[model samples]
Target: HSDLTFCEIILMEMESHDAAWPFLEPVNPRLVSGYRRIIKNPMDFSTMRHRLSRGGYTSSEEFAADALLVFDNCQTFNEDDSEVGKAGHIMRRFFESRWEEFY
Candidate 1:
């Protein structure tokens, strides 16, 4: 309970919302896998399997990337209304953290 990563926490909260259920249910398997592939080094992927079987990650950049994707997915799936504004808010926060890249 105490150790859930930001990614898992946001996802879990989104899941808790009945309206947000149908969309992010499966989450992003390919995006999840690709992140590990990018972090391909000894224990790197292991460190970032989410807060599932493993544990929390150390890279804010990577988490921000994942969070941004999650938020984007949420925004898209429920597009034009519903919980999209909430999702967009989450996305905006992460994107703000990476403002340098936005330029």
Candidate 2:
């Protein structure tokens, strides 16, 4: 089986989740002041897709790491009580639950 295909399946489900709206694209550093300064390694569903297509991921775990990074960055930059933060948690949980089903 293809490792990339496994990663792609997980990513597609994550991107389609309703709570994934905030993470669908990269955060605009200019609009979101100080975002670039705070989150050094920013990750998003869009970037993950590109990486997957380009064979950037070597294993399922590597893909998982980047997937989790998106939410981790969200938690770092947004308040837990804020809308974006809550969505991050929701999306994170969704990813974990889906991941467990396979791994």
Candidate 3:
């Protein structure tokens, strides 16, 4: 229970961050061209939340993997200097820092 709580805490923090706005929901393929091809497995906070509730993750590491996937996919689809890219970097840093403190 404690271990799962850690995952939940980190997820909530990430979801509430200002930088999390773009990543709160999945990218729409029609709006963002090539996202489907570039990022084969897209991830977002909403999906993570649903997965968490459904016991999709067996361990904290699995939860972390999905979290990291969102950032990685953002970096792949958006340029570093772009708005979404910058947010992704910030979100990734925040998540990593919290993860380090927890583990």
Candidate 4:
């Protein structure tokens, strides 16, 4: 049997929360494509879990914090210094602008 996609898992979770079901159900294609794009490189989740456990991060928030730290450290931008700095600045601005909306 084929493994279920991340979008499918998200859809199942959304069903439990009545509010997000309509929004989540219609966006599977986009969500699946986005998920694939973001996680194109396969990583060892077992290793990650082990590392998280070793670091005393038992909860999802702590794990997410650790993941974001790794993500920030590994992110690449354009080679040009100005371009890279500008891209990072713009991304931070965009994130700050949308932060409240998500919360």
User: Which segments of model 1 are wrong by more than 4 Å?
Assistant: 1-58, 83-103
Please tell me which predicted candidate would have the highest TM-score against the true structure. 3
Per residue, candidate 1 scores C-alpha lDDT tens digits across 30-99 of 6554433433222211223444445454544555455455555545444445564564564456445544
Q: Which parts of model 3 are misplaced by more than 4 Å?
A: none
Per-model TM values vs. the true structure:
0.34, 0.94, 0.96, 0.27
- Pairs in clash, predicted candidate 2: none
Across 1-103, the per-residue lDDT of candidate 4 in tens digits comes to 0122322332233334333212222223354445445544332223344554465544444443433332342243222245434443444343334333433
Better of 2 and 3 by lDDT: 3
> Lowest-scoring 10 consecutive residues by lDDT in candidate 3?
31-40
In candidate 1, residue 56 scores what lDDT?
A: 53
Ranking by lDDT: 3, 2, 1, 4
The regions of model 2 sitting more than 4 angstroms off are: none
What does candidate 3's lDDT look like per residue over 1-103, in tens digits? 7779999999899889998999898889999878778889999999999999998888898898999999888888899999889989999999999999999
User: How many angstroms is residue 40 displaced in model 1 relative to the true structure, after the best TM-score fit?
Assistant: 20
lDDT of predicted model 4 = 0.35
lDDT of 2 by residue, 11-97 (tens): 988888899899989999989989988999999999999998887888889988998889889999999999999999999998999
Better candidate number, 1 or 4, judged by TM-score: 1
